[PDB]
Amino acid sequence: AEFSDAVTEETLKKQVAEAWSRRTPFSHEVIVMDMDPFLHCVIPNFIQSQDFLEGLQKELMNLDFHEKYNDLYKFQQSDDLKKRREPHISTLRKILFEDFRSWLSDISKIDLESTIDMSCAKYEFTDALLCHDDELEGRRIAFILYLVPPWDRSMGGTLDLYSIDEHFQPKQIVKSLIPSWNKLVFFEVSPVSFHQVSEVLSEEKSRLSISGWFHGPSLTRPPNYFEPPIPRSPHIPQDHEILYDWINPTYLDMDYQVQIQEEFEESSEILLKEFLKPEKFTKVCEALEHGHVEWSSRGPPNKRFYEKAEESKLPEILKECMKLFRSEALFLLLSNFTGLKLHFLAPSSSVPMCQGELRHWKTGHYTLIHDHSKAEFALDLILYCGCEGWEPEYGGFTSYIAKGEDEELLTVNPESNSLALVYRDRETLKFVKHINHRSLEQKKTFPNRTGFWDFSFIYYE
Numbered sequence: 514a515e516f517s518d519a520v521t522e523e524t525l526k527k528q529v530a531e532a533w534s535r536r537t538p539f540s541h542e543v544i545v546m547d548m549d550p551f552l553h554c555v556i557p558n559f560i561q562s563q564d565f566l567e568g569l570q571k572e573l574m575n576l577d578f579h580e581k582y583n584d585l586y587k588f589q590q591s592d593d594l595k596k597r598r599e600p601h602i603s604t605l606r607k608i609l610f611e612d613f614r615s616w617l618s619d620i621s622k623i624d625l626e627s628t629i630d631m632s633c634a635k636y637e638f639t640d641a642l643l644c645h646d647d648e649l650e651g652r653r654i655a656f657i658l659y660l661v662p663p664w665d666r667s668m669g670g671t672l673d674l675y676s677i678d679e680h681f682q683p684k685q686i687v688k689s690l691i692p693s694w695n696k697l698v699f700f701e702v703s704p705v706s707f708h709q710v711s712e713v714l715s716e717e718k719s720r721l722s723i724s725g726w727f728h729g730p731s732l733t734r735p736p737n738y739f740e741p742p743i744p745r746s747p748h749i750p751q752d753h754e755i756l757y758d759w760i761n762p763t764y765l766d767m768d769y770q771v772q773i774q775e776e777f778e779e780s781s782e783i784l785l786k787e788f789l790k791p792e793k794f795t796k797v798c799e800a801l802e803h804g805h806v807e808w809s810s811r812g813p814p815n816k817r818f819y820e821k822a823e824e825s826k827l828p829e830i831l832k833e834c835m836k837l838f839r840s841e842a843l844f845l846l847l848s849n850f851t852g853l854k855l856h857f858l859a860p861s862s863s864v865p866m867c868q869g870e871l872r873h874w875k876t877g878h879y880t881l882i883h884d885h886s887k888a889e890f891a892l893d894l895i896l897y898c899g900c901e902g903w904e905p906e907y908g909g910f911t912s913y914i915a916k917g918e919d920e921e922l923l924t925v926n927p928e929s930n931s932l933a934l935v936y937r938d939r940e941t942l943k944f945v946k947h948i949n950h951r952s953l954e955q956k957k958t959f960p961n962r963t964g965f966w967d968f969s970f971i972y973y974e
């Protein structure tokens with residue numbers, strides 16, 4: 514087999530070359546090329562032999578697939594295609610990396626290498642690949658061939674293209690391409706080529722694709738942009754006594770704190786159930802639902818996506834709960850839980866500090882590791898609210914990982930009125946995993962509720 518004789522036709526080929534050269538859009542029945550938000554082209558009916566595609570799909574489905582998972586994605590990848598000796602796959606490598614490569618090199622005027630870089634992916638219900646730019650030394654042009662069943666927008670799995678802002682960071686989705694059988698999409702890898710594969714919503718269908726890169730000369734990325742640091746502050750001096758009013762009395766007994774600390778110094782992590790008094794916890798949840806909390810979406814999409822409350826406008830109960838977590842008394846309680854010096858009367862410049870946010874998590878939200886995700890000695894605190902009947906399979910758990918390793922260290926799951934404490938070192942990073950569409954099952958038991966909320970606080974010695 515071969516690829517579309519149409520696009521190899523010399524006049525059309527020269528029209529394509531002209532549009533790439535001049536960076537101008539070009540529309541044709543057999544090819545469509547757009548320059549915004551960045552250069553991307555679509556060739557439908559990429560391989561004319563329908564017999565070949567059937568045999569190819571048959572070979573791929575008969576491969577073994579392996580779960581792939583981290584902050585950025587969740588899907589399945591096949592045995593390496595570079596190592597396969599089945600005829601249809603072997604033929605595809607040649608078509609792509611010899612025939613089609615030269616055609617691309619000709620229209621793009623890039624000395625593309627013959628280096629084979631291709632793989633087969635399978636996205637099913639809740640699989641997704643979040644905002645990223647494909648950046649990796651050598652990659653110049655990304656391509657995707659789709660071998661999907663009949664597909665539409667409501668099934669998800671669309672390839673979305675992000676616009677960009679004044680700081681070269683993704684802003685919003687401005688193009689959304691729907692996969693279809695024998696459709697080839699390719700685009701230029703650049704500092705601005707931010708894109709994602711939206712969550713697959715089809716509970717029955719499987720989004721099968723072949724994707725990879727043509728390699729070429731390395732360029733220079735501009736220096737990466739650094740967010741301003743989040744302000745930190747020391748404890749709020751106790752005026753009125755606050756622990757007694759808020760915390761389960763179990764945790765204010767000395768005998769129980771030594772137990773807690775013995776366990777904490779062993780694991781550097783602990784979970785404290787029923788942490789707030791029930792009456793307070795119920796009033797906090799009630800205020801989060803009915804109290805006119807003002808939420809705002811946080812970005813950018815290659816770092817985070819979630820809602821954060823404007824603390825100054827909160828209901829008094831939620832203000833008071835934020836105060837609890839900044840309070841001198843709590844700083845000392847956390848010292849007795851952990852063995853860390855977060856108050857000057859704890860057992861033995863520097864001044865302990867903290868930062869805090871009240872967050873709302875729903876379907877679609879996440880955080881990602883990014884080049885500037887910075888590691889520090891620090892104690893994390895999370896109190897979850899409004900997540901009754903929440904399952905880890907829904908996403909939304911916090912995960913800790915050793916830097917530059919797939920060795921996962923710990924996972925904290927949303928649990929109503931559970932206080933999680935985690936001490937990190939400078940070689941530890943964290944993320945909140947994409948909340949997927951299984952989380953809609955939450956409404957079967959609590960219909961007047963969308964996702965969950967948490968108080969997230971970080972303390973430093």
Ligand SMILES: O=C(O)c1ccnc(C(=O)O)c1
Nearest residue numbers: 634647657672709710722724
């Ligand atoms: O398989 C895809 O649709 C796809 C699209 C964009 N990027 C990737 C990737 O693996 O980076 C995969």
Ligand SMILES: [Mn+2]
Nearest residue numbers: 645646647655
């Ligand atoms: Mn990609």
